[PDB]
């Protein structure tokens, strides 16, 4: 997160870190005791999922291993359309004041809605610095029609854009898969941006979670 702020202790109990062993690979968001939602480009054969702390590599926070990933079958390694993936934990996580599933959206929030995205991505670019504490950035949903003025054909129908005009406040490397929450629901997953990060008027780009409600439900289901 570029030009962000330290998220407030325990206001983000749905935040998880996907680690490659010890080391930050991606963000993620808890959606149930057994399931984590993240970007498809974050996929690995296994993860260690850190839950329940704002501090990355917190020795007190529980890590749960996960080996099974369910990428949206439409994911494109070329365009990054459908950049969403569910991950099944090896064991369920106990809920508490530091660990809580996020609210999945019932509707799509419109342009202009105020949001916050969080992660442990670098706070500088291109020269990288990785933080201990979870960082937050307040952004606003930008309409497809505006965002297209910048990104043109790069933008698919289920990519959502967010940012602040004339401001560097944005996502960056390591923030991938993390939550964009607007109005107490998850509206986005961090997908991509321009590089270097934090360029004014270059929106951050997100998988628009309201468009995948059937798929998430179908994939998570536990009964029928």
């Amino acid at each position: 997160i570029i030009d962000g702020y330290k998220c407030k202790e325990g206001s983000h109990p749905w935040q998880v870190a996907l680690l490659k062993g010890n080391q930050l690979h991606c963000g993620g968001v808890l959606v149930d005791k057994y399931w984590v939602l993240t970007a498809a480009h974050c996929k690995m054969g296994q993860y260690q999922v850190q839950l329940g702390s704002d501090k990355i590599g917190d020795q007190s926070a529980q890590k749960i291993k996960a080996t099974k990933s369910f990428r949206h079958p439409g994911y494109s390694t070329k365009t990054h359309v459908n950049d969403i993936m569910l991950v099944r934990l090896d064991e369920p996580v106990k809920m508490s004041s530091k660990v809580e599933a996020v609210q999945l959206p019932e509707h799509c929030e419109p342009p202009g809605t105020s949001c916050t995205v969080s992660g442990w991505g670098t706070t500088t670019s291109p020269d990288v610095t990785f933080p201990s504490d979870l960082m937050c950035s307040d952004v606003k949903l930008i309409s497809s029609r505006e965002c297209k003025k910048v990104y043109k054909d790069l933008l698919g129908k289920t990519m959502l854009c967010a940012g602040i005009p004339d401001s560097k406040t944005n996502t960056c490397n390591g923030d991938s898969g993390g939550p964009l929450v607007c109005n107490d629901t998850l509206q986005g997953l961090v997908s991509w941006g321009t590089y270097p990060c934090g360029q004014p008027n270059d929106p951050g780009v997100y998988t628009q979670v309201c468009k995948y409600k059937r798929w998430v439900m179908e994939t998570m289901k536990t009964h029928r």
Side-chain angles (χ1 to χ4, degrees):
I1 301 299
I2 312 288
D3 204 4
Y5 60 96
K6 259 187 82 175
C7 312
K8 226 166 128 110
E9 175 88 325
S11 300
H12 299 271
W14 47 76
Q15 180 76 55
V16 303
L18 308 178
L19 316 172
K20 174 174 4 185
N22 253 309
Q23 124 199 146
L24 172 62
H25 189 64
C26 270
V29 28
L30 190 68
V31 291
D32 170 86
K33 71 201 208 277
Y34 261 122
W35 289 100
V36 167
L37 204 45
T38 188
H41 75 253
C42 289
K43 196 184 137 133
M44 313 183 284
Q46 45 178 303
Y47 325 75
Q48 297 294 317
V49 183
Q50 181 189 290
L51 315 97
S53 176
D54 302 300
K55 263 109 156 63
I56 187 84
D58 187 337
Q59 285 316 71
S60 66
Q62 191 189 1
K63 281 110 221 151
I64 293 178
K65 185 197 223 155
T67 62
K68 302 197 143 148
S69 308
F70 305 72
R71 265 212 289 229
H72 190 282
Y75 172 57
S76 170
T77 52
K78 268 3 171 98
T79 58
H80 309 280
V81 304
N82 302 311
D83 189 2
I84 180 168
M85 176 172 68
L86 273 166
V87 172
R88 173 78 180 196
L89 301 178
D90 279 12
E91 301 186 346
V93 70
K94 307 285 168 279
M95 298 297 165
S96 78
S97 78
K98 301 301 196 201
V99 179
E100 182 203 285
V102 80
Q103 258 294 132
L104 294 175
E106 260 177 295
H107 66 295
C108 304
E109 277 303 355
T113 301
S114 282
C115 309
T116 302
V117 57
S118 53
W120 290 276
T122 172
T123 66
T124 57
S125 186
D127 44 318
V128 298
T129 336
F130 290 100
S132 175
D133 303 286
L134 190 72
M135 300 303 285
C136 272
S137 176
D138 303 332
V139 294
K140 281 176 182 81
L141 297 194
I142 303 179
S143 72
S144 297
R145 216 273 254 180
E146 276 313 286
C147 200
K148 241 112 95 193
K149 284 171 177 158
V150 184
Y151 291 139
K152 330 272 34 176
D153 338 73
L154 300 182
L155 260 204
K157 310 158 179 289
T158 69
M159 300 183 189
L160 179 59
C161 294
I164 296 290
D166 297 313
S167 177
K168 308 167 96 313
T169 202
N170 224 317
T171 54
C172 200
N173 288 98
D175 291 320
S176 294
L180 180 73
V181 177
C182 315
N183 246 45
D184 315 305
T185 69
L186 180 83
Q187 290 294 304
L189 303 168
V190 182
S191 186
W192 61 275
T194 65
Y195 173 96
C197 304
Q199 295 181 61
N201 308 304
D202 278 7
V205 185
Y206 303 78
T207 310
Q208 190 182 196
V209 171
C210 69
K211 293 295 178 72
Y212 289 89
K213 156 202 311 141
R214 175 156 79 201
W215 176 80
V216 163
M217 175 162 327
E218 175 52 42
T219 304
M220 283 173 77
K221 75 159 150 232
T222 206
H223 298 282
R224 272 194 186 197

